[PDB]
Amino acid sequence: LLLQTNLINYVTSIRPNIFVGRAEGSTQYGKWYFEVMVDEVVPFLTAQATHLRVGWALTEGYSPYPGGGEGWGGNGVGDDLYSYGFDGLHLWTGHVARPVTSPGQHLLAPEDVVSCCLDLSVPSISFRINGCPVQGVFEAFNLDGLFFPVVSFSAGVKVRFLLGGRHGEFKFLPPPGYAPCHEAVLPRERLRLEPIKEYRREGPRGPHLVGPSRCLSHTDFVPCPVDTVQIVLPPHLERIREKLAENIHELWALTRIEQGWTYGPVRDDNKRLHPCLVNFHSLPEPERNYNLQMSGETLKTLLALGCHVGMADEKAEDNLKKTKLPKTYMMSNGYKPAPLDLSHVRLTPAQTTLVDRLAENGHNVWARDRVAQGWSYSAVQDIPARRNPRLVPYRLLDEATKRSNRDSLCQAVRTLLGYGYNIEPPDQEPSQVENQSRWDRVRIFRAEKSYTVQSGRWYFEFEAVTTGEMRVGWARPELRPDVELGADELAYVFNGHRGQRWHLGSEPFGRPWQSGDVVGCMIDLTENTIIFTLNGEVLMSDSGSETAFREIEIGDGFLPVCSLGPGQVGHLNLGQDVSSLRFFAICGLQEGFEPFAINMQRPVTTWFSKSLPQFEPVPPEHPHYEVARMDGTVDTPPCLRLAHRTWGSQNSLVEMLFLRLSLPVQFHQHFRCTDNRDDPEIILNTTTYYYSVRVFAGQEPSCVWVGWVTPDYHQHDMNFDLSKVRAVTVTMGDEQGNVHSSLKCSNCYMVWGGDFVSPGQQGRISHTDLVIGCLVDLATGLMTFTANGKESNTFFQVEPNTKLFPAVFVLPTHQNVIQFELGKQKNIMPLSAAMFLSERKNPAPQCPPRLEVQMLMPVSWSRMPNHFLQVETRRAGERLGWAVQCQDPLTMMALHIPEENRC
Amino acid sequence: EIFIYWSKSHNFKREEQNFVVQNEINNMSFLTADSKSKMARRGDRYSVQTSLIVATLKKMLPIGLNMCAPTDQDLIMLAKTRYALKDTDEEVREFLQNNLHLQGKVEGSPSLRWQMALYRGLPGREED
Amino acid sequence: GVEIETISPGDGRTFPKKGQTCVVHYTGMLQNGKKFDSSRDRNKPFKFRIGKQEVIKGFEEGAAQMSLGQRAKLTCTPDVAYGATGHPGVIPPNATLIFDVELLNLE
């Protein structure tokens, strides 16, 4: 009942930017291997034990925000189902430590080796300690997202990443079929070690607030071209089927003539004297007409893209000539340019973009074909192992290869343009790569509520390192964290990505900045004015007005606020040090303004919108969703009915909704070894608890999920299904097979309401409400579900000391959606004995005021610590690899909420 | 001093707009010309805010206030009061000599302490 | 009675026998995972005379098996622990105690 406090060390995670994953037709090999070398470990630098874990993590939700969180803080690898960790004695996953038998098991001591084996062909993650195998492997885990190495560590550690090859030597023999992890580096980038998605990085003058990091996706490694089969070949194209082939039969051969690769009559192509500029008739017939129909294939790509041709001017055939240059002269059947010659011809930017995507659709077909022949990516080329450094999609390719592909087809489209046939751009369709996670795009930064100002004139700076979507201005204390600034009256902000001001809308104002600019924001509570100064120059609206906003009420006050888009960097200078200000003397000093933090000792407590879902109770004034507490009558048990207030009306809110009860049920400490009236002698001893939910008529069960959730569920998916449910099975056995412990752990325990309906021909809107029930047995950990009074096939088993929250995931499709029924059945005890200790022997069900229905708020406010862990990361050398060092201790006292199990 | 004459000579004000209306002075190009070079009705004919004298004043004002020490604003507001009582330039000079020692103190307010640091730190500020 | 799992074993040669004080720098936790007592917070080693029954029976019988510089995770049942009477105001009745003991030194 009482909140607990304890001193907890700060824990940070460091990863190499090696990203691997599997997908249908993926271009990434699914077996990998790396190692971690332990140099020095301090067993107890502070009161809490030193945290040090090694393992993999997932790129789409493993966000170990520094500070408090799940369990008792210090969350790292394995504290949630987005990561799997091994620390020398435990296989950490789902915030539960499970011991594993090892040949001389101990914690990660100095001079130790941890080897990680990843397989994606089958779900398996193997571990080796000092080369000795670990008798436990994760299986049956989610494949979506990407897997990357990561080390979670408190202060007082020195770990080194052994990546093999050039970044180490692995000190051992990796298992067969498993490739070194250093081969997965994408060519456009260079290997480096950076922490997980953060919000602050130190800079020369001060901390740099960091907007969300753009994350690569597995879907971005499958090459998805436009199909070039169902295209009937047009007459105007077969009419020009020849010259566009003749000009690309030796265009790659033209560069190297009169060099060391100069042709000879005795040999042919691919013999280090390739050119053979004579003609393609001398060249072999299959590759010849293949080259013709490859020119046709490029024209078919032009068709599928949306390019069409039209002839206007003089025929280029007349005013074109072949130039027998002194260079490219050959003795084999006369000399000529290797492709067909062309005179002065130019190309517009539409043609540049079109040839870019034309080369893209060539590369992605080549990569698709190679994958269909089994090939995959490796940063070092291995022909007998069938791996290439260029088997990545064009968007991920390197600029050298991009240019090399684009040059040939640029010449081709140039030759097409010479004949006067138009290259018609297709229609433009604006598309967004990622749309679902609208919240992982803006990270609102502001000050603590205690720094709120209601008088005077204030000044602060905001150096815009990048030139993306970053907003800086002033906001009211009750600024919502999940709503972009300017959408409501709680913000007065200037969006200088393109020069707009935002307050209850958007209108143009001023000019956009560039890199390195300093945005000095004004506020004048006495004169009720807001001004924005860029590089010491007062910005102007679309008029002669010098003030961005005017006649602003004092209200509750205003705070210095800013937000950053994905991949953005912004230095905030609130004015703790006056000398650090760049344009204060130029603007602000002579007009009575003062720095916001001019006379303060400690840095201003800055709060950031923490974009991680949490469970919070419904507001009583919510316009869309309301929860009604219905009293338990003589025949009906107490209920929590959820009704959509604005359903079926204009401007309604319709989206996937996650619901849960505010109180958990904890399974028993030790599991057991091996008319219609409840009998008093057994109802006082039963350990089975049942609750039901009434899916109201008109609410489709096809989009209803019913069951339980552990308190670490932070998965907000608007297109959620049972596939996205996080789960992992850990198998333990002896040294040679003999799997004796197969434990399944999950955060979400849901069943689908669409499997609990009889599939009739028509009439899916059943007049009878669907009452799905759930039974849990605390003494055994086994739980089942009932469809309409009959038990179902699905069941779940859980480990002891596990917390489950009653949850229903539903998309509202009626005025009345669901109703949580806290009922009871024949010889089954209600939840009042499974949630309240004092009501353990109270058979009559009740709904006390503490139990209340909760939503899943996507973004909630949080506090950034005044100090962060200092991590020293560098490349020790060719032999060693990358070293991570951290010695400075940092401790936090965290208030822990027991029932929610979060501090 | 030009603005003093403008503020006191009523006929100067009166025929200021007469020159404006007879010459159709827009008064917006003289201020927003650099705004157009930077790619960025109610008072269409004439207004006090669009006058060039104050338009020059708003740009000169940080420069003029730059010379004055942070210990002298307290003298400026009381100077505004005595100027409101219509005291000439000689009279206000004598009043300054009457209350020279009433100026601000460096430890009198924390707001003044940083003002001294950023004022006296300039190279052109001489202690003599 | 008590289940011991080694964590960071030391020498494994010399054991604390009768006659000398046992100096442990431990960390106690309840079975639910909520820490209830430690010695690193007090920053002073816990010195207890062996064999005088001044410490609980589970801790006393556990402390013999570890060696000098050996850190082990114990598991004391309520029978070898405070049991039904528990510890008034600290430990609830019939609780299993897990101790992250570290026998750092003797005397």
Swiss-Prot record, chain B:
It is found in: Sarcoplasmic reticulum membrane. The N-terminus is blocked. Channel activity is modulated by phosphorylation. It comes from the Eukaryota. Detected in skeletal muscle (at protein level). Fast- or slow-twitch skeletal muscle. Homotetramer. Can also form heterotetramers with RYR2. Identified in a complex composed of RYR1, PDE4D, PKA, FKBP1A and protein phosphatase 1 (PP1). Repeated very high-level exercise decreases interaction with PDE4D and protein phosphatase 1 (PP1). Interacts with CALM; CALM with bound calcium inhibits the RYR1 channel activity. Interacts with S100A1. Interacts with FKBP1A; this stabilizes the closed conformation of the channel. Interacts with CACNA1S; interaction with CACNA1S is important for activation of the RYR1 channel. Interacts with CACNB1. The calcium release channel activity resides in the C-terminal region while the remaining part of the protein constitutes the 'foot' structure spanning the junctional gap between the sarcoplasmic reticulum (SR) and the T-tubule. Pore opening is mediated via the cytoplasmic calcium-binding domains that mediate a small rotation of the channel-forming transmembrane regions that then leads to channel opening. Binding of [3H]ryanodine indicates that the heterozygous channel is activated by Ca(2+) concentrations 4-fold lower than normal. Single-cell analysis of cotransfected cells shows a significantly increased resting cytoplasmic Ca(2+) level and a significantly reduced luminal Ca(2+) level. Belongs to the ryanodine receptor (TC 1.A.3.1) family. RYR1 subfamily. Cytosolic calcium-activated calcium channel that mediates the release of Ca(2+) from the sarcoplasmic reticulum into the cytosol and thereby plays a key role in triggering muscle contraction following depolarization of T-tubules. Repeated very high-level exercise increases the open probability of the channel and leads to Ca(2+) leaking into the cytoplasm. Can also mediate the release of Ca(2+) from intracellular stores in neurons, and may thereby promote prolonged Ca(2+) signaling in the brain. Required for normal embryonic development of muscle fibers and skeletal muscle. This is Ryanodine receptor 1. It comes from Oryctolagus cuniculus (Rabbit). The lineage of its organism: Eukaryota, Metazoa, Chordata, Craniata, Vertebrata.
From Swiss-Prot, chain C:
This is Peptidyl-prolyl cis-trans isomerase FKBP1B. Residues 19-107 form the PPIase FKBP-type domain. The keyword Phosphoprotein does not apply. SUPFAM superfamilies: FKBP-like. Keywords: Cytoplasm, Isomerase, Rotamase, Sarcoplasmic reticulum. Inhibited by both FK506 and rapamycin. Its EC number is 5.2.1.8. Belongs to the FKBP-type PPIase family. FKBP1 subfamily. Pfam families: FKBP_C. Has the potential to contribute to the immunosuppressive and toxic effects of FK506 and rapamycin. PPIases accelerate the folding of proteins. It catalyzes the cis-trans isomerization of proline imidic peptide bonds in oligopeptides. One of its GO terms (biological process) is insulin secretion involved in cellular response to glucose stimulus. It is found in: Cytoplasm; Sarcoplasmic reticulum. One of its GO terms (cellular component) is Z disc. It comes from Homo sapiens. It catalyses: [protein]-peptidylproline (omega=180) = [protein]-peptidylproline (omega=0). It comes from the Eukaryota. PANTHER family: PEPTIDYL-PROLYL CIS-TRANS ISOMERASE, PEPTIDYL-PROLYL CIS-TRANS ISOMERASE FKBP1B.
